[PDB]
């Protein structure tokens, strides 16, 4: 129709190591294109192609062009939940009980298409222009549900301070805990601004700590007791007692007034 319309410029990194922010030469919109020098891709498409929720990064298309591959998505523009948490400190309680609901609304979401992100973690949770998160990055999701049948998993996948303690330990594991528990430890980097160990093993020393309920240590002191006791629910080795997301949605602390709206209107007399 409109001439120039397809035309986007590449005007910045996003990241590397690439994505890259895309403005349209018509219109002025923002897109985020992520550039693979193809030489998983074909999952972390055919994933996308499937998802369309708000706490979800969108997915636009992508274009083959050769052996390059160009994947469009939703530009994100407050970046990284990462860069919102204070080494050390982590941030204030409200802001991350907002952000832990955004981020279990988008967990239903994909859980409830049959869908694990599998690599949960403040990188791939991205923030929009009024800091609403968005999951992204789904390279290493998969489909755990079809056909109304679950299927358990086995491959190794994820990040280690982040991963659930039966990948680590049993040959077989149910999708869903696991992505329950790397939401666990999300929050605690929310809260404490540091992760509670290198990985959830009996070998590691913080994590026997924790087992020994030494809440007086690291970042659990720092954490108040009612997201505290959230966590204890949330960080049980046992994935079978570990709690659900329908019962974490019914948690004391998750139901907590706490924050105030976005505020806007403000005149007096
Ligand atoms: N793990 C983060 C990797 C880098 C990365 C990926 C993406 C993807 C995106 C696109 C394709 C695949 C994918 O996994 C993510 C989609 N939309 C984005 O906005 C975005 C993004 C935005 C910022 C940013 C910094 N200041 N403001 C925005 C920084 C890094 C980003």
Redesign the pocket.
Known sequence: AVPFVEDWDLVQT???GE?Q?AVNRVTEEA????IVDMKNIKK?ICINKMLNHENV?KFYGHRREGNIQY?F????????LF?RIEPDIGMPEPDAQRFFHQLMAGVVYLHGIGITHRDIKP??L??DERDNL?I????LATVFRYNNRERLLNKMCGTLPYVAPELLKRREFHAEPVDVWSCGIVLTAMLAGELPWDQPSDSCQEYSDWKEKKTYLNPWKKIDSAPLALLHKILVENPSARITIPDIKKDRWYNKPLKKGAKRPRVTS
């Open positions: 996003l990241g590397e994505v922010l897109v985020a294109v992520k972390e990064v994947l998505l939703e530009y994100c523009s407050g970046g990284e860069d990188e791939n991205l923030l968005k992204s990055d789904f390279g």
